[PDB]
Amino acid sequence: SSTASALGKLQDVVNQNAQALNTLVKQLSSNFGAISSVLNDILSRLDPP
Amino acid sequence: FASVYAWNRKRISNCVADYSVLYNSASFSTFKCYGVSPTKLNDLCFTNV
């Protein structure tokens, strides 16, 4: 009851999963060498070819 | 029209631009755009042209 720092392994597993999801969803905001990081603007702004 | 080393500069904003009447005219020898397909020009709103 007193010492909160008792369940470390479960918290570590949860943190690892959450961080993996966070970086996976954050990777969506990169140009990867393109002109924009959002696909809708590319569709609505530029010629298909 | 001024010289190339003294190129004339102008800023336009706060208006509605119809590029179709610019596109259909054949009086222009070269009509070449880079970041936008000309036929979609009328479908976008910018600032500080």
Side-chain angles (χ1 to χ4, degrees):
Chain A
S1 184
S2 49
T3 304
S5 48
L7 289 87
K9 305 173 71 66
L10 317 176
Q11 188 51 51
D12 289 329
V13 160
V14 176
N15 295 349
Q16 284 168 343
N17 287 342
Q19 192 171 5
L21 290 174
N22 283 357
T23 179
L24 172 60
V25 75
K26 192 189 317 304
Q27 276 286 116
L28 269 176
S29 164
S30 304
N31 294 1
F32 289 124
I35 64 170
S36 179
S37 171
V38 57
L39 188 152
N40 271 282
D41 294 15
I42 300 169
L43 289 181
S44 59
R45 189 151 72 70
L46 187 151
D47 204 4
Chain B
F1 279 13
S3 181
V4 60
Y5 82 101
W7 38 279
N8 187 41
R9 162 69 159 261
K10 182 180 290 187
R11 172 217 293 279
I12 191 65
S13 291
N14 189 359
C15 59
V16 174
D18 177 19
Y19 309 88
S20 68
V21 299
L22 278 75
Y23 194 10
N24 55 6
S25 173
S27 304
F28 314 111
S29 65
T30 304
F31 182 79
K32 177 257 291 180
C33 315
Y34 279 110
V36 286
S37 167
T39 176
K40 283 183 161 157
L41 283 170
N42 295 279
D43 297 334
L44 303 170
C45 193
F46 316 92
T47 72
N48 189 179
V49 178

